C-alpha cells in the first residue's frame, strides 16, 4: 500500500497472509487473501500460477506483522488449491484472476472465530456498490514501487470505485479492463495497492454489510496518475465460487 495507515488485524479480521516455503529454510510472503467461510480463503490465481505446488504454501490468519508472530494467529496448510480455468494474463491485465484455497490446520480443523479472525461477506449476484463509493484495501505490499522488501506492519488505505467508462478511457487502460473487473483509485493518485497486496481484498459496504467487492489483481505502476488499480469483480464470479464452496 502506498500511503495509508499502519493497522492491526482486528481492523481486517478476514485478511489471510499466504507465504511459500523454500528448501533452504526461508519462508517468503506471496500474496494476501480473504476468509469467506471457515475452510476457504479466496485470493488471485496469478499469485500461484508459476508455482502451483500446494504443499509448499502456508496460510496464517490473525496476523498483524509479516515475519514476527501476533498472538491469536492460526497457521494452515493448503488442502486444495483451485485456480481458475480460463485465467489469462496479457501485457497488463490478468483475466479471471481469482483462486480458492481450502485450509486445514495440523490438527485437522478450519479457522475458528476470534477478535482477530472473522469472515467477510460475499456480494449477491452481479450486485456492486455504485461508483464513487469509498472502499478500503489492506495488505503487506510495497510502500513505494522502488522498494524490494515488504513492510512488517499491516497497512490499509481507502480508495474510490471509479466507473468502467472512466477506466476504459484510452489514456487509462482502454479495453484491457473488462466487465469482470472493477477499477478503484484515489482522487489525488496518492494512495493505492501495489505488488504484494495482490490477492487481497477491496471491501465496501453493500446493503449494510462489509462485502468483499474486489480482489487486488493488476495495475500499471503504483499510485500512478490515470492508472487505477484493477480488481477482479467478485459479484460476477459467484457461480464459480459456489461450484467449489458448497
Amino acid at each position: 500500500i502506498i500511503g495509508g495507515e499502519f493497522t492491526t488485524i482486528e481492523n481486517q479480521p478476514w485478511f489471510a497472509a499466504i507465504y511459500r516455503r523454500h528448501r533452504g529454510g526461508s519462508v517468503t510472503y506471496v500474496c494476501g487473501g480473504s476468509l469467506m467461510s471457515p475452510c476457504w480463503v479466496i485470493s488471485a490465481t496469478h499469485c500461484f500460477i508459476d508455482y502451483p505446488k500446494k504443499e509448499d504454501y502456508i496460510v496464517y490468519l490473525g496476523r498483524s506483522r509479516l515475519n514476527s508472530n501476533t498472538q491469536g494467529e492460526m497457521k494452515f496448510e493448503v488442502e486444495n488449491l483451485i485456480l481458475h480455468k480460463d485465467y489469462s494474463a496479457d501485457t497488463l491485465a490478468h483475466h479471471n484472476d481469482i483462486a480458492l484455497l481450502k485450509i486445514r490446520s495440523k490438527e485437522g480443523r478450519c479457522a475458528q472465530p476470534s477478535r482477530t479472525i472473522q469472515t467477510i461477506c460475499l456480494p449477491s449476484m452481479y450486485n456492486d456498490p455504485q461508483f464513487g463509493t469509498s472502499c478500503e484495501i489492506t495488505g503487506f505490499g510495497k510502500e513505494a514501487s522502488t522498494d524490494y522488501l515488504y513492510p512488517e506492519q499491516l497497512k490499509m488505505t481507502v480508495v474510490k470505485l471509479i466507473s468502467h467508462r472512466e477506466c476504459q478511457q484510452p489514456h487509462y487502460y482502454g479495453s484491457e479492463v473488462t466487465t469482470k473487473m472493477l477499477c478503484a483509485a484515489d482522487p489525488q493518485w496518492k494512495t493505492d495497492s501495489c505488488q504484494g497486496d495482490s490477492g487481497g481484498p477491496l471491501v465496501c459496504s453493500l446493503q449494510g454489510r462489509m462485502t468483499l467487492t474486489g480482489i487486488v489483481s493488476w495495475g500499471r505502476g503504483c499510485a500512478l496518475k490515470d492508472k487505477p488499480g484493477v480488481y477482479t469483480r467478485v459479484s460476477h464470479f459467484l457461480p464459480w465460487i459456489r461450484s467449489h464452496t458448497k
Binding site: 481492523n11 481486517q12 477478535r115 472473522q118 467477510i120 462489509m210
Partner: peptide, 10 residues
C-alpha cells in the same frame, strides 16, 4: 463466539 461475516470487534 461464531462467525458473522463483515463484523469487526474493537
Amino acid at each position: 463466539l461464531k462467525f458473522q461475516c463483515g463484523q469487526k470487534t474493537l
